[PDB]
PDB file of all heavy atoms in Angstrom:
ATOM      1  N   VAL A   1       0.850  -1.245  -0.044  1.00 42.26           N
ATOM      2  CA  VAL A   1      -0.084   0.012   0.023  1.00 42.26           C
ATOM      3  C   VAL A   1       0.842   1.301  -0.025  1.00 42.26           C
ATOM      4  O   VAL A   1       1.987   1.240   0.500  1.00 42.26           O
ATOM      5  CB  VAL A   1      -0.910  -0.034   1.195  1.00 42.26           C
ATOM      6  CG1 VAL A   1      -0.326   0.677   2.420  1.00 42.26           C
ATOM      7  CG2 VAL A   1      -2.228   0.657   0.863  1.00 42.26           C
ATOM      8  N   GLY A   2       0.365   2.343  -0.522  1.00 44.67           N
ATOM      9  CA  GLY A   2       0.990   3.607  -0.540  1.00 44.67           C
ATOM     10  C   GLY A   2       1.667   3.893  -1.883  1.00 44.67           C
ATOM     11  O   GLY A   2       1.485   3.237  -2.813  1.00 44.67           O
ATOM     12  N   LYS A   3       2.532   4.884  -1.847  1.00 45.56           N
ATOM     13  CA  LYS A   3       3.043   5.448  -3.077  1.00 45.56           C
ATOM     14  C   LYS A   3       3.825   4.425  -3.919  1.00 45.56           C
ATOM     15  O   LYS A   3       3.932   4.583  -5.104  1.00 45.56           O
ATOM     16  CB  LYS A   3       4.048   6.657  -2.721  1.00 45.56           C
ATOM     17  CG  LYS A   3       4.452   7.498  -3.836  1.00 45.56           C
ATOM     18  CD  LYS A   3       5.865   7.050  -4.272  1.00 45.56           C
ATOM     19  CE  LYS A   3       6.217   7.615  -5.599  1.00 45.56           C
ATOM     20  NZ  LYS A   3       7.540   7.213  -6.021  1.00 45.56           N
ATOM     21  N   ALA A   4       4.416   3.443  -3.305  1.00 43.71           N
ATOM     22  CA  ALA A   4       5.157   2.389  -4.050  1.00 43.71           C
ATOM     23  C   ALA A   4       4.210   1.534  -4.869  1.00 43.71           C
ATOM     24  O   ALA A   4       4.815   0.829  -5.739  1.00 43.71           O
ATOM     25  CB  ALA A   4       6.015   1.585  -3.100  1.00 43.71           C
ATOM     26  N   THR A   5       2.973   1.466  -4.675  1.00 43.17           N
ATOM     27  CA  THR A   5       2.098   0.638  -5.356  1.00 43.17           C
ATOM     28  C   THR A   5       1.521   1.340  -6.514  1.00 43.17           C
ATOM     29  O   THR A   5       0.405   0.987  -6.984  1.00 43.17           O
ATOM     30  CB  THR A   5       0.878   0.177  -4.478  1.00 43.17           C
ATOM     31  OG1 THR A   5       0.285  -0.993  -4.883  1.00 43.17           O
ATOM     32  CG2 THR A   5      -0.129   1.191  -4.366  1.00 43.17           C
ATOM     33  N   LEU A   6       2.215   2.318  -7.089  1.00 46.28           N
ATOM     34  CA  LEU A   6       1.602   3.259  -7.943  1.00 46.28           C
ATOM     35  C   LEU A   6       2.269   3.121  -9.359  1.00 46.28           C
ATOM     36  O   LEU A   6       3.473   3.054  -9.532  1.00 46.28           O
ATOM     37  CB  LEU A   6       1.891   4.727  -7.466  1.00 46.28           C
ATOM     38  CG  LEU A   6       1.117   5.866  -8.032  1.00 46.28           C
ATOM     39  CD1 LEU A   6      -0.276   5.796  -7.461  1.00 46.28           C
ATOM     40  CD2 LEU A   6       1.690   7.135  -7.417  1.00 46.28           C
ATOM     41  N   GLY A   7       1.383   2.926 -10.394  1.00 48.03           N
ATOM     42  CA  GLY A   7       1.876   2.549 -11.642  1.00 48.03           C
ATOM     43  C   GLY A   7       2.130   1.128 -11.863  1.00 48.03           C
ATOM     44  O   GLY A   7       3.065   0.809 -12.755  1.00 48.03           O
ATOM     45  N   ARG A   8       1.593   0.270 -11.106  1.00 44.69           N
ATOM     46  CA  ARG A   8       1.927  -1.197 -11.199  1.00 44.69           C
ATOM     47  C   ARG A   8       0.699  -1.960 -11.063  1.00 44.69           C
ATOM     48  O   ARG A   8      -0.333  -1.520 -10.398  1.00 44.69           O
ATOM     49  CB  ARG A   8       2.985  -1.595 -10.133  1.00 44.69           C
ATOM     50  CG  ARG A   8       4.274  -0.821 -10.318  1.00 44.69           C
ATOM     51  CD  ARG A   8       5.355  -1.581  -9.680  1.00 44.69           C
ATOM     52  NE  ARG A   8       5.455  -2.883 -10.253  1.00 44.69           N
ATOM     53  CZ  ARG A   8       6.348  -3.782  -9.795  1.00 44.69           C
ATOM     54  NH1 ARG A   8       7.178  -3.561  -8.818  1.00 44.69           N
ATOM     55  NH2 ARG A   8       6.384  -5.039 -10.485  1.00 44.69           N
ATOM     56  N   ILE A   9       0.675  -3.181 -11.610  1.00 45.47           N
ATOM     57  CA  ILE A   9      -0.396  -4.106 -11.551  1.00 45.47           C
ATOM     58  C   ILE A   9      -0.242  -5.110 -10.443  1.00 45.47           C
ATOM     59  O   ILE A   9       0.825  -5.511 -10.256  1.00 45.47           O
ATOM     60  CB  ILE A   9      -0.584  -4.847 -12.933  1.00 45.47           C
ATOM     61  CG1 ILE A   9      -0.671  -3.816 -14.107  1.00 45.47           C
ATOM     62  CG2 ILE A   9      -1.817  -5.702 -12.957  1.00 45.47           C
ATOM     63  CD1 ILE A   9      -0.559  -4.565 -15.349  1.00 45.47           C
ATOM     64  N   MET A  10      -1.280  -5.414  -9.735  1.00 44.04           N
ATOM     65  CA  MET A  10      -1.164  -6.243  -8.621  1.00 44.04           C
ATOM     66  C   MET A  10      -2.204  -7.396  -8.581  1.00 44.04           C
ATOM     67  O   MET A  10      -3.315  -7.265  -9.212  1.00 44.04           O
ATOM     68  CB  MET A  10      -1.197  -5.561  -7.358  1.00 44.04           C
ATOM     69  CG  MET A  10      -0.081  -4.674  -7.054  1.00 44.04           C
ATOM     70  SD  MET A  10      -0.263  -3.509  -5.792  1.00 44.04           S
ATOM     71  CE  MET A  10      -0.606  -4.607  -4.435  1.00 44.04           C
ATOM     72  N   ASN A  11      -1.837  -8.449  -7.956  1.00 40.65           N
ATOM     73  CA  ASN A  11      -2.819  -9.554  -7.659  1.00 40.65           C
ATOM     74  C   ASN A  11      -3.766  -9.313  -6.577  1.00 40.65           C
ATOM     75  O   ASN A  11      -3.692  -8.062  -6.139  1.00 40.65           O
ATOM     76  CB  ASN A  11      -1.974 -10.821  -7.270  1.00 40.65           C
ATOM     77  CG  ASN A  11      -2.584 -12.104  -7.813  1.00 40.65           C
ATOM     78  OD1 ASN A  11      -3.669 -12.074  -8.369  1.00 40.65           O
ATOM     79  ND2 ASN A  11      -2.032 -13.258  -7.497  1.00 40.65           N
ATOM     80  N   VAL A  12      -4.682 -10.153  -6.345  1.00 40.44           N
ATOM     81  CA  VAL A  12      -5.555  -9.936  -5.196  1.00 40.44           C
ATOM     82  C   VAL A  12      -4.679 -10.171  -3.973  1.00 40.44           C
ATOM     83  O   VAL A  12      -5.025  -9.516  -2.978  1.00 40.44           O
ATOM     84  CB  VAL A  12      -6.790 -10.987  -5.227  1.00 40.44           C
ATOM     85  CG1 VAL A  12      -6.185 -12.348  -5.225  1.00 40.44           C
ATOM     86  CG2 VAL A  12      -7.579 -10.747  -4.026  1.00 40.44           C
ATOM     87  N   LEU A  13      -3.691 -10.988  -3.957  1.00 38.99           N
ATOM     88  CA  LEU A  13      -2.835 -11.211  -2.766  1.00 38.99           C
ATOM     89  C   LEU A  13      -1.858 -10.106  -2.725  1.00 38.99           C
ATOM     90  O   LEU A  13      -0.862 -10.299  -1.864  1.00 38.99           O
ATOM     91  CB  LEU A  13      -2.153 -12.565  -2.825  1.00 38.99           C
ATOM     92  CG  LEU A  13      -3.259 -13.728  -2.976  1.00 38.99           C
ATOM     93  CD1 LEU A  13      -2.421 -14.999  -3.442  1.00 38.99           C
ATOM     94  CD2 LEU A  13      -3.937 -13.990  -1.718  1.00 38.99           C
ATOM     95  N   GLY A  14      -1.970  -9.106  -3.449  1.00 40.41           N
ATOM     96  CA  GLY A  14      -0.873  -8.022  -3.352  1.00 40.41           C
ATOM     97  C   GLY A  14       0.468  -8.355  -4.099  1.00 40.41           C
ATOM     98  O   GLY A  14       1.422  -7.686  -3.957  1.00 40.41           O
ATOM     99  N   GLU A  15       0.504  -9.525  -4.890  1.00 39.67           N
ATOM    100  CA  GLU A  15       1.626  -9.901  -5.497  1.00 39.67           C
ATOM    101  C   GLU A  15       1.793  -9.069  -6.800  1.00 39.67           C
ATOM    102  O   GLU A  15       0.718  -8.833  -7.454  1.00 39.67           O
ATOM    103  CB  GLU A  15       1.659 -11.410  -5.872  1.00 39.67           C
ATOM    104  CG  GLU A  15       1.729 -12.204  -4.532  1.00 39.67           C
ATOM    105  CD  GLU A  15       1.252 -13.662  -4.903  1.00 39.67           C
ATOM    106  OE1 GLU A  15       1.037 -13.897  -6.099  1.00 39.67           O
ATOM    107  OE2 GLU A  15       1.322 -14.483  -3.935  1.00 39.67           O
ATOM    108  N   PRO A  16       2.961  -8.754  -7.359  1.00 40.29           N
ATOM    109  CA  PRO A  16       3.038  -8.052  -8.640  1.00 40.29           C
ATOM    110  C   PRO A  16       2.753  -9.044  -9.726  1.00 40.29           C
ATOM    111  O   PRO A  16       3.244 -10.156  -9.689  1.00 40.29           O
ATOM    112  CB  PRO A  16       4.463  -7.568  -8.470  1.00 40.29           C
ATOM    113  CG  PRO A  16       5.232  -8.540  -7.836  1.00 40.29           C
ATOM    114  CD  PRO A  16       4.252  -8.905  -6.678  1.00 40.29           C
ATOM    115  N   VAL A  17       2.034  -8.542 -10.717  1.00 40.33           N
ATOM    116  CA  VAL A  17       1.710  -9.448 -11.844  1.00 40.33           C
ATOM    117  C   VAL A  17       2.193  -8.962 -13.199  1.00 40.33           C
ATOM    118  O   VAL A  17       2.147  -9.721 -14.190  1.00 40.33           O
ATOM    119  CB  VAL A  17       0.075  -9.487 -11.799  1.00 40.33           C
ATOM    120  CG1 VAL A  17      -0.377  -9.736 -13.251  1.00 40.33           C
ATOM    121  CG2 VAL A  17      -0.382 -10.701 -10.927  1.00 40.33           C
ATOM    122  N   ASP A  18       2.555  -7.743 -13.234  1.00 43.10           N
ATOM    123  CA  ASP A  18       3.410  -7.305 -14.371  1.00 43.10           C
ATOM    124  C   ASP A  18       4.801  -7.994 -14.232  1.00 43.10           C
ATOM    125  O   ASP A  18       5.113  -8.474 -13.204  1.00 43.10           O
ATOM    126  CB  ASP A  18       3.583  -5.829 -14.598  1.00 43.10           C
ATOM    127  CG  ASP A  18       3.797  -5.169 -13.272  1.00 43.10           C
ATOM    128  OD1 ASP A  18       4.411  -5.747 -12.367  1.00 43.10           O
ATOM    129  OD2 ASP A  18       3.443  -4.021 -13.101  1.00 43.10           O
ATOM    130  N   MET A  19       5.653  -7.925 -15.270  1.00 44.97           N
ATOM    131  CA  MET A  19       6.773  -8.701 -15.268  1.00 44.97           C
ATOM    132  C   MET A  19       8.036  -7.875 -14.591  1.00 44.97           C
ATOM    133  O   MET A  19       9.089  -8.395 -14.554  1.00 44.97           O
ATOM    134  CB  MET A  19       7.263  -8.990 -16.656  1.00 44.97           C
ATOM    135  CG  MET A  19       6.140  -9.758 -17.486  1.00 44.97           C
ATOM    136  SD  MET A  19       5.560 -11.255 -16.707  1.00 44.97           S
ATOM    137  CE  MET A  19       7.034 -12.343 -16.989  1.00 44.97           C
ATOM    138  N   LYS A  20       7.611  -6.837 -14.016  1.00 46.26           N
ATOM    139  CA  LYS A  20       8.779  -5.985 -13.363  1.00 46.26           C
ATOM    140  C   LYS A  20       9.042  -6.678 -11.989  1.00 46.26           C
ATOM    141  O   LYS A  20       8.685  -7.716 -11.632  1.00 46.26           O
ATOM    142  CB  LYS A  20       8.324  -4.607 -13.203  1.00 46.26           C
ATOM    143  CG  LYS A  20       7.825  -3.946 -14.421  1.00 46.26           C
ATOM    144  CD  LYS A  20       7.455  -2.449 -14.210  1.00 46.26           C
ATOM    145  CE  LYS A  20       6.937  -1.817 -15.502  1.00 46.26           C
ATOM    146  NZ  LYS A  20       6.792  -0.353 -15.276  1.00 46.26           N
ATOM    147  N   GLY A  21       9.940  -6.084 -11.229  1.00 48.22           N
ATOM    148  CA  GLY A  21      10.467  -6.574 -10.007  1.00 48.22           C
ATOM    149  C   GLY A  21       9.303  -6.462  -8.845  1.00 48.22           C
ATOM    150  O   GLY A  21       8.194  -6.140  -9.121  1.00 48.22           O
ATOM    151  N   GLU A  22       9.759  -6.838  -7.638  1.00 49.54           N
ATOM    152  CA  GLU A  22       8.905  -6.670  -6.535  1.00 49.54           C
ATOM    153  C   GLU A  22       8.574  -5.318  -6.250  1.00 49.54           C
ATOM    154  O   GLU A  22       9.165  -4.360  -6.762  1.00 49.54           O
ATOM    155  CB  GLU A  22       9.664  -7.228  -5.389  1.00 49.54           C
ATOM    156  CG  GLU A  22       9.930  -8.814  -5.362  1.00 49.54           C
ATOM    157  CD  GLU A  22       9.971  -9.479  -3.992  1.00 49.54           C
ATOM    158  OE1 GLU A  22      10.723  -8.930  -3.169  1.00 49.54           O
ATOM    159  OE2 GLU A  22       9.331 -10.452  -3.724  1.00 49.54           O
ATOM    160  N   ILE A  23       7.401  -5.162  -5.588  1.00 48.17           N
ATOM    161  CA  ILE A  23       6.882  -3.832  -5.046  1.00 48.17           C
ATOM    162  C   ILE A  23       7.682  -3.401  -3.896  1.00 48.17           C
ATOM    163  O   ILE A  23       7.595  -4.097  -2.875  1.00 48.17           O
ATOM    164  CB  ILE A  23       5.457  -3.958  -4.775  1.00 48.17           C
ATOM    165  CG1 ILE A  23       4.688  -4.679  -5.933  1.00 48.17           C
ATOM    166  CG2 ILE A  23       4.785  -2.568  -4.599  1.00 48.17           C
ATOM    167  CD1 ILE A  23       3.204  -4.455  -6.068  1.00 48.17           C
ATOM    168  N   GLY A  24       8.371  -2.279  -4.013  1.00 48.42           N
ATOM    169  CA  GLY A  24       9.180  -1.824  -2.843  1.00 48.42           C
ATOM    170  C   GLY A  24       8.358  -1.028  -1.834  1.00 48.42           C
ATOM    171  O   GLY A  24       8.530   0.078  -1.686  1.00 48.42           O
ATOM    172  N   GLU A  25       7.277  -1.762  -1.287  1.00 47.48           N
ATOM    173  CA  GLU A  25       6.488  -1.097  -0.376  1.00 47.48           C
ATOM    174  C   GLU A  25       7.093  -1.040   1.054  1.00 47.48           C
ATOM    175  O   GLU A  25       7.846  -1.977   1.498  1.00 47.48           O
ATOM    176  CB  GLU A  25       5.067  -1.824  -0.261  1.00 47.48           C
ATOM    177  CG  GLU A  25       5.041  -2.985   0.726  1.00 47.48           C
ATOM    178  CD  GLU A  25       5.923  -4.102   0.346  1.00 47.48           C
ATOM    179  OE1 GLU A  25       6.947  -3.805  -0.173  1.00 47.48           O
ATOM    180  OE2 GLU A  25       5.500  -5.257   0.569  1.00 47.48           O
ATOM    181  N   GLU A  26       6.757   0.140   1.722  1.00 46.99           N
ATOM    182  CA  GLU A  26       7.140   0.236   3.170  1.00 46.99           C
ATOM    183  C   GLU A  26       6.158  -0.337   4.111  1.00 46.99           C
ATOM    184  O   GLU A  26       6.530  -0.655   5.283  1.00 46.99           O
ATOM    185  CB  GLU A  26       7.393   1.710   3.528  1.00 46.99           C
ATOM    186  CG  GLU A  26       8.268   2.451   2.454  1.00 46.99           C
ATOM    187  CD  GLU A  26       8.963   3.672   3.111  1.00 46.99           C
ATOM    188  OE1 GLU A  26       8.291   4.173   4.071  1.00 46.99           O
ATOM    189  OE2 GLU A  26       9.851   4.218   2.658  1.00 46.99           O
ATOM    190  N   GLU A  27       4.944  -0.603   3.789  1.00 45.65           N
ATOM    191  CA  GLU A  27       3.891  -0.803   4.718  1.00 45.65           C
ATOM    192  C   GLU A  27       2.960  -1.815   4.011  1.00 45.65           C
ATOM    193  O   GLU A  27       2.703  -1.717   2.798  1.00 45.65           O
ATOM    194  CB  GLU A  27       3.140   0.415   5.108  1.00 45.65           C
ATOM    195  CG  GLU A  27       2.096   0.209   6.096  1.00 45.65           C
ATOM    196  CD  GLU A  27       1.533   1.515   6.693  1.00 45.65           C
ATOM    197  OE1 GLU A  27       1.912   2.513   6.198  1.00 45.65           O
ATOM    198  OE2 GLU A  27       0.908   1.489   7.745  1.00 45.65           O
ATOM    199  N   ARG A  28       2.253  -2.668   4.839  1.00 44.15           N
ATOM    200  CA  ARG A  28       1.303  -3.511   4.352  1.00 44.15           C
ATOM    201  C   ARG A  28       0.041  -3.497   5.186  1.00 44.15           C
ATOM    202  O   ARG A  28       0.160  -3.362   6.468  1.00 44.15           O
ATOM    203  CB  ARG A  28       1.801  -4.999   4.264  1.00 44.15           C
ATOM    204  CG  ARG A  28       2.845  -5.106   3.307  1.00 44.15           C
ATOM    205  CD  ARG A  28       3.454  -6.473   3.289  1.00 44.15           C
ATOM    206  NE  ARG A  28       2.556  -7.475   2.633  1.00 44.15           N
ATOM    207  CZ  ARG A  28       2.811  -7.913   1.359  1.00 44.15           C
ATOM    208  NH1 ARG A  28       3.847  -7.676   0.612  1.00 44.15           N
ATOM    209  NH2 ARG A  28       1.871  -8.775   0.888  1.00 44.15           N
ATOM    210  N   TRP A  29      -1.188  -3.417   4.624  1.00 46.60           N
ATOM    211  CA  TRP A  29      -2.413  -3.253   5.408  1.00 46.60           C
ATOM    212  C   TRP A  29      -3.328  -4.534   5.182  1.00 46.60           C
ATOM    213  O   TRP A  29      -3.130  -5.150   4.176  1.00 46.60           O
ATOM    214  CB  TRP A  29      -3.104  -2.016   4.862  1.00 46.60           C
ATOM    215  CG  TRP A  29      -2.851  -0.798   5.606  1.00 46.60           C
ATOM    216  CD1 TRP A  29      -1.851  -0.536   6.379  1.00 46.60           C
ATOM    217  CD2 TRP A  29      -3.511   0.443   5.464  1.00 46.60           C
ATOM    218  NE1 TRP A  29      -1.761   0.801   6.818  1.00 46.60           N
ATOM    219  CE2 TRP A  29      -2.808   1.416   6.246  1.00 46.60           C
ATOM    220  CE3 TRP A  29      -4.666   0.837   4.807  1.00 46.60           C
ATOM    221  CZ2 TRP A  29      -3.170   2.668   6.441  1.00 46.60           C
ATOM    222  CZ3 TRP A  29      -5.143   2.106   4.920  1.00 46.60           C
ATOM    223  CH2 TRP A  29      -4.406   3.031   5.779  1.00 46.60           C
ATOM    224  N   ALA A  30      -4.103  -4.734   6.191  1.00 47.52           N
ATOM    225  CA  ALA A  30      -5.053  -5.895   6.082  1.00 47.52           C
ATOM    226  C   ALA A  30      -6.316  -5.453   5.246  1.00 47.52           C
ATOM    227  O   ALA A  30      -6.806  -4.300   5.406  1.00 47.52           O
ATOM    228  CB  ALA A  30      -5.427  -6.349   7.406  1.00 47.52           C
ATOM    229  N   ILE A  31      -6.767  -6.297   4.332  1.00 49.66           N
ATOM    230  CA  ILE A  31      -7.805  -5.946   3.454  1.00 49.66           C
ATOM    231  C   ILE A  31      -9.174  -5.940   4.038  1.00 49.66           C
ATOM    232  O   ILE A  31     -10.055  -5.501   3.507  1.00 49.66           O
ATOM    233  CB  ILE A  31      -7.862  -6.804   2.145  1.00 49.66           C
ATOM    234  CG1 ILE A  31      -8.244  -8.131   2.509  1.00 49.66           C
ATOM    235  CG2 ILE A  31      -6.524  -6.856   1.575  1.00 49.66           C
ATOM    236  CD1 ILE A  31      -8.375  -9.050   1.273  1.00 49.66           C
ATOM    237  N   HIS A  32      -9.235  -6.259   5.346  1.00 50.95           N
ATOM    238  CA  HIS A  32     -10.499  -6.339   6.101  1.00 50.95           C
ATOM    239  C   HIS A  32     -10.415  -5.211   7.099  1.00 50.95           C
ATOM    240  O   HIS A  32      -9.564  -5.230   8.046  1.00 50.95           O
ATOM    241  CB  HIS A  32     -10.780  -7.677   6.810  1.00 50.95           C
ATOM    242  CG  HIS A  32     -11.069  -8.676   5.723  1.00 50.95           C
ATOM    243  ND1 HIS A  32     -12.271  -8.799   5.094  1.00 50.95           N
ATOM    244  CD2 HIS A  32     -10.368  -9.855   5.395  1.00 50.95           C
ATOM    245  CE1 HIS A  32     -12.282  -9.829   4.356  1.00 50.95           C
ATOM    246  NE2 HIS A  32     -11.080 -10.514   4.422  1.00 50.95           N
ATOM    247  N   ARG A  33     -11.359  -4.323   7.028  1.00 52.24           N
ATOM    248  CA  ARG A  33     -11.338  -3.029   7.856  1.00 52.24           C
ATOM    249  C   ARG A  33     -12.718  -2.605   8.133  1.00 52.24           C
ATOM    250  O   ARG A  33     -13.647  -3.062   7.498  1.00 52.24           O
ATOM    251  CB  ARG A  33     -10.555  -1.928   7.114  1.00 52.24           C
ATOM    252  CG  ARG A  33      -9.362  -2.356   6.419  1.00 52.24           C
ATOM    253  CD  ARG A  33      -8.679  -1.187   5.775  1.00 52.24           C
ATOM    254  NE  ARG A  33      -7.968  -0.328   6.824  1.00 52.24           N
ATOM    255  CZ  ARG A  33      -6.953  -0.738   7.575  1.00 52.24           C
ATOM    256  NH1 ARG A  33      -6.438  -1.894   7.405  1.00 52.24           N
ATOM    257  NH2 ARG A  33      -6.378   0.032   8.352  1.00 52.24           N
ATOM    258  N   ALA A  34     -12.913  -1.742   9.160  1.00 53.31           N
ATOM    259  CA  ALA A  34     -14.150  -1.155   9.529  1.00 53.31           C
ATOM    260  C   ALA A  34     -14.323   0.155   8.784  1.00 53.31           C
ATOM    261  O   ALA A  34     -13.323   0.873   8.478  1.00 53.31           O
ATOM    262  CB  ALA A  34     -14.296  -0.937  10.954  1.00 53.31           C
ATOM    263  N   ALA A  35     -15.530   0.436   8.478  1.00 55.22           N
ATOM    264  CA  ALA A  35     -15.832   1.664   7.852  1.00 55.22           C
ATOM    265  C   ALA A  35     -15.681   2.919   8.744  1.00 55.22           C
ATOM    266  O   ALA A  35     -15.771   2.725   9.914  1.00 55.22           O
ATOM    267  CB  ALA A  35     -17.301   1.650   7.263  1.00 55.22           C
ATOM    268  N   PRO A  36     -15.316   4.048   8.127  1.00 56.52           N
ATOM    269  CA  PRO A  36     -15.191   5.249   8.978  1.00 56.52           C
ATOM    270  C   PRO A  36     -16.399   5.570   9.795  1.00 56.52           C
ATOM    271  O   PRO A  36     -17.543   5.274   9.387  1.00 56.52           O
ATOM    272  CB  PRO A  36     -14.895   6.302   7.947  1.00 56.52           C
ATOM    273  CG  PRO A  36     -15.366   5.846   6.679  1.00 56.52           C
ATOM    274  CD  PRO A  36     -15.269   4.364   6.601  1.00 56.52           C
ATOM    275  N   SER A  37     -16.190   6.234  10.981  1.00 55.94           N
ATOM    276  CA  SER A  37     -17.199   6.473  11.848  1.00 55.94           C
ATOM    277  C   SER A  37     -18.102   7.518  11.219  1.00 55.94           C
ATOM    278  O   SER A  37     -17.695   8.321  10.464  1.00 55.94           O
ATOM    279  CB  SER A  37     -16.626   6.917  13.167  1.00 55.94           C
ATOM    280  OG  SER A  37     -15.508   6.165  13.459  1.00 55.94           O
ATOM    281  N   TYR A  38     -19.353   7.550  11.752  1.00 51.15           N
ATOM    282  CA  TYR A  38     -20.306   8.523  11.269  1.00 51.15           C
ATOM    283  C   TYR A  38     -19.777   9.988  11.633  1.00 51.15           C
ATOM    284  O   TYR A  38     -20.057  10.972  10.999  1.00 51.15           O
ATOM    285  CB  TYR A  38     -21.582   8.378  12.027  1.00 51.15           C
ATOM    286  CG  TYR A  38     -22.526   9.538  11.839  1.00 51.15           C
ATOM    287  CD1 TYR A  38     -23.560   9.539  10.832  1.00 51.15           C
ATOM    288  CD2 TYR A  38     -22.486  10.681  12.553  1.00 51.15           C
ATOM    289  CE1 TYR A  38     -24.440  10.585  10.645  1.00 51.15           C
ATOM    290  CE2 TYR A  38     -23.340  11.798  12.360  1.00 51.15           C
ATOM    291  CZ  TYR A  38     -24.319  11.674  11.479  1.00 51.15           C
ATOM    292  OH  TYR A  38     -25.160  12.704  11.328  1.00 51.15           O
ATOM    293  N   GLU A  39     -19.014  10.135  12.771  1.00 51.76           N
ATOM    294  CA  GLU A  39     -18.485  11.412  13.181  1.00 51.76           C
ATOM    295  C   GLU A  39     -17.379  11.904  12.148  1.00 51.76           C
ATOM    296  O   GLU A  39     -17.313  13.212  12.114  1.00 51.76           O
ATOM    297  CB  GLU A  39     -17.780  11.348  14.538  1.00 51.76           C
ATOM    298  CG  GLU A  39     -16.961  12.437  14.926  1.00 51.76           C
ATOM    299  CD  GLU A  39     -16.329  12.165  16.233  1.00 51.76           C
ATOM    300  OE1 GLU A  39     -16.695  11.240  16.883  1.00 51.76           O
ATOM    301  OE2 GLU A  39     -15.342  12.799  16.665  1.00 51.76           O
TER     302      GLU A  39
END
């Protein structure tokens, strides 16, 4: 996730699917999250 995931194609599992190298991401997030609060 973040700026390093930009301009690249990714799998559902976050794996890179274009033939370029690995995604040089600094951070990884879980795909299951709660929606923002009403506030």
Side-chain angles (χ1 to χ4, degrees):
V1 90
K3 188 258 167 184
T5 204
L6 200 68
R8 297 206 59 187
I9 305 173
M10 287 167 65
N11 210 359
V12 61
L13 304 165
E15 298 166 358
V17 150
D18 45 28
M19 308 300 290
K20 307 185 183 188
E22 290 203 313
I23 312 201
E25 89 292 39
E26 307 201 340
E27 180 170 16
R28 296 178 76 105
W29 272 14
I31 70 177
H32 290 289
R33 316 185 73 69
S37 322
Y38 170 99
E39 168 185 345

